[model samples]
Target: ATQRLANFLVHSSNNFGAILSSTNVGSNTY
Candidate 1:
Protein backbone atom coordinates (compact mmCIF):
# COMPACT_ATOMS: atom_id res chain seq x y z
CA ALA A 1 0.00 0.00 0.00
CA THR A 2 2.78 2.40 0.82
CA GLN A 3 4.59 1.76 -2.44
CA ARG A 4 1.44 2.24 -4.45
CA LEU A 5 0.67 5.48 -2.68
CA ALA A 6 4.17 6.76 -3.36
CA ASN A 7 3.91 5.89 -7.02
CA PHE A 8 0.59 7.66 -7.27
CA LEU A 9 2.00 10.78 -5.67
CA VAL A 10 4.97 10.80 -8.03
CA HIS A 11 2.72 10.45 -11.03
CA SER A 12 0.50 13.22 -9.76
CA SER A 13 3.47 15.52 -9.30
CA ASN A 14 4.68 14.86 -12.81
CA ASN A 15 1.26 15.68 -14.21
CA PHE A 16 1.14 18.83 -12.14
CA GLY A 17 4.50 19.91 -13.50
CA ALA A 18 3.33 19.40 -17.04
CA ILE A 19 0.26 21.52 -16.35
CA LEU A 20 2.36 24.25 -14.80
CA SER A 21 4.70 24.32 -17.76
CA SER A 22 1.80 24.65 -20.14
CA THR A 23 0.38 27.50 -18.10
CA ASN A 24 3.70 29.27 -18.15
CA VAL A 25 3.84 29.04 -21.89
CA GLY A 26 0.37 30.49 -22.22
CA SER A 27 1.16 33.32 -19.86
CA ASN A 28 4.35 34.16 -21.70
CA THR A 29 2.46 34.57 -24.96
CA TYR A 30 0.82 37.73 -23.63
Candidate 2:
Protein backbone atom coordinates (compact mmCIF):
# COMPACT_ATOMS: atom_id res chain seq x y z
CA ALA A 1 0.00 0.00 0.00
CA THR A 2 2.70 2.44 0.93
CA GLN A 3 4.79 1.76 -2.16
CA ARG A 4 1.81 1.85 -4.48
CA LEU A 5 0.50 5.10 -3.01
CA ALA A 6 3.91 6.72 -3.04
CA ASN A 7 4.58 5.62 -6.59
CA PHE A 8 1.25 6.94 -7.77
CA LEU A 9 1.72 10.27 -6.04
CA VAL A 10 5.18 10.76 -7.49
CA HIS A 11 4.11 9.61 -10.92
CA SER A 12 1.15 12.00 -10.89
CA SER A 13 3.37 14.87 -9.84
CA ASN A 14 5.74 14.24 -12.74
CA ASN A 15 2.93 13.77 -15.24
CA PHE A 16 0.90 16.75 -13.97
CA GLY A 17 3.77 19.22 -13.91
CA ALA A 18 6.70 17.73 -15.83
CA ILE A 19 4.65 16.39 -18.72
CA LEU A 20 2.22 19.33 -18.69
CA SER A 21 4.53 22.37 -18.50
CA SER A 22 8.03 20.87 -18.43
CA THR A 23 10.26 23.98 -18.52
CA ASN A 24 7.40 26.37 -17.67
CA VAL A 25 8.89 29.42 -19.35
CA GLY A 26 7.37 32.61 -20.78
CA SER A 27 3.58 33.14 -20.37
CA ASN A 28 1.44 30.86 -18.27
CA THR A 29 -0.29 28.04 -20.15
CA TYR A 30 -3.22 28.09 -17.66
Candidate 3:
Protein backbone atom coordinates (compact mmCIF):
# COMPACT_ATOMS: atom_id res chain seq x y z
CA ALA A 1 0.00 0.00 0.00
CA THR A 2 2.77 2.46 0.80
CA GLN A 3 4.65 1.83 -2.44
CA ARG A 4 1.53 2.36 -4.48
CA LEU A 5 0.85 5.64 -2.76
CA ALA A 6 4.36 6.83 -3.42
CA ASN A 7 4.10 5.95 -7.09
CA PHE A 8 0.89 7.92 -7.40
CA LEU A 9 2.42 10.97 -5.77
CA VAL A 10 5.42 10.99 -8.10
CA HIS A 11 3.23 10.61 -11.17
CA SER A 12 1.15 13.59 -10.11
CA SER A 13 4.23 15.66 -9.46
CA ASN A 14 5.57 15.02 -12.95
CA ASN A 15 2.23 15.93 -14.47
CA PHE A 16 1.98 19.16 -12.51
CA GLY A 17 5.56 20.08 -13.42
CA ALA A 18 4.64 20.12 -17.08
CA ILE A 19 1.60 22.24 -16.38
CA LEU A 20 3.59 24.74 -14.29
CA SER A 21 6.52 25.08 -16.68
CA SER A 22 4.37 26.88 -19.20
CA THR A 23 3.32 29.57 -16.72
CA ASN A 24 6.89 30.13 -15.48
CA VAL A 25 8.37 30.60 -18.97
CA GLY A 26 8.02 34.36 -19.04
CA SER A 27 10.05 35.46 -16.04
CA ASN A 28 13.56 35.59 -17.47
CA THR A 29 13.46 39.24 -18.48
CA TYR A 30 13.13 40.83 -15.07
Candidate 4:
Protein backbone atom coordinates (compact mmCIF):
# COMPACT_ATOMS: atom_id res chain seq x y z
CA ALA A 1 0.00 0.00 0.00
CA THR A 2 2.82 2.40 0.73
CA GLN A 3 4.44 1.66 -2.59
CA ARG A 4 1.16 2.28 -4.31
CA LEU A 5 0.93 5.72 -2.76
CA ALA A 6 4.46 6.52 -3.85
CA ASN A 7 3.74 5.55 -7.40
CA PHE A 8 0.59 7.62 -7.45
CA LEU A 9 2.45 10.68 -6.22
CA VAL A 10 5.15 10.28 -8.82
CA HIS A 11 2.57 10.02 -11.56
CA SER A 12 0.71 13.10 -10.36
CA SER A 13 3.90 15.11 -10.10
CA ASN A 14 4.92 14.24 -13.61
CA ASN A 15 1.51 15.27 -14.90
CA PHE A 16 1.60 18.53 -12.99
CA GLY A 17 5.05 19.39 -14.26
CA ALA A 18 4.01 18.66 -17.80
CA ILE A 19 1.10 21.07 -17.52
CA LEU A 20 3.26 23.79 -16.04
CA SER A 21 5.86 23.48 -18.76
CA SER A 22 3.15 23.48 -21.40
CA THR A 23 1.67 26.71 -20.06
CA ASN A 24 5.07 28.30 -19.80
CA VAL A 25 5.74 27.56 -23.43
CA GLY A 26 2.40 28.96 -24.48
CA SER A 27 3.01 32.19 -22.62
CA ASN A 28 6.46 32.54 -24.13
CA THR A 29 5.02 32.12 -27.61
CA TYR A 30 2.47 34.90 -27.05
Best by lDDT: 2
lDDT of the structure predicted as candidate 2: 0.47
- In model 1, the runs with Cα more than 4 Å from the true position are 1-25
TM-scores for all candidates: the values are: 0.11, 0.16, 0.11, 0.11
Least accurate 10 contiguous residues by lDDT in model 3:
5-14
The total number of steric clashes, by the backbone 3 Å criterion, in model 4 comes to 0
With a 3 Å backbone cut-off (N, CA, C), the pairs that clash in candidate 3 are none
Predicted candidate 3 versus true structure: per-residue lDDT over 1-30, tens digit per residue: 355433334444334343433455556755
**In order, what lDDT does every prediction score?**
0.42, 0.47, 0.45, 0.42
- Choose 1 or 2, whichever is better by TM-score: 2
State which candidate has the highest TM-score. 2
Candidate 2 TM-score over all chains jointly? 0.16
Give per-candidate clash totals: 0, 0, 0, 0
* Model 1: per-residue Cα lDDT over 1-30, one tens digit each: 355433334444334343433345546543
Who is ahead in lDDT, 2 or 3?
A: 2
- What residue runs in model 2 are displaced by over 4 Å at the alpha carbon? 1-21
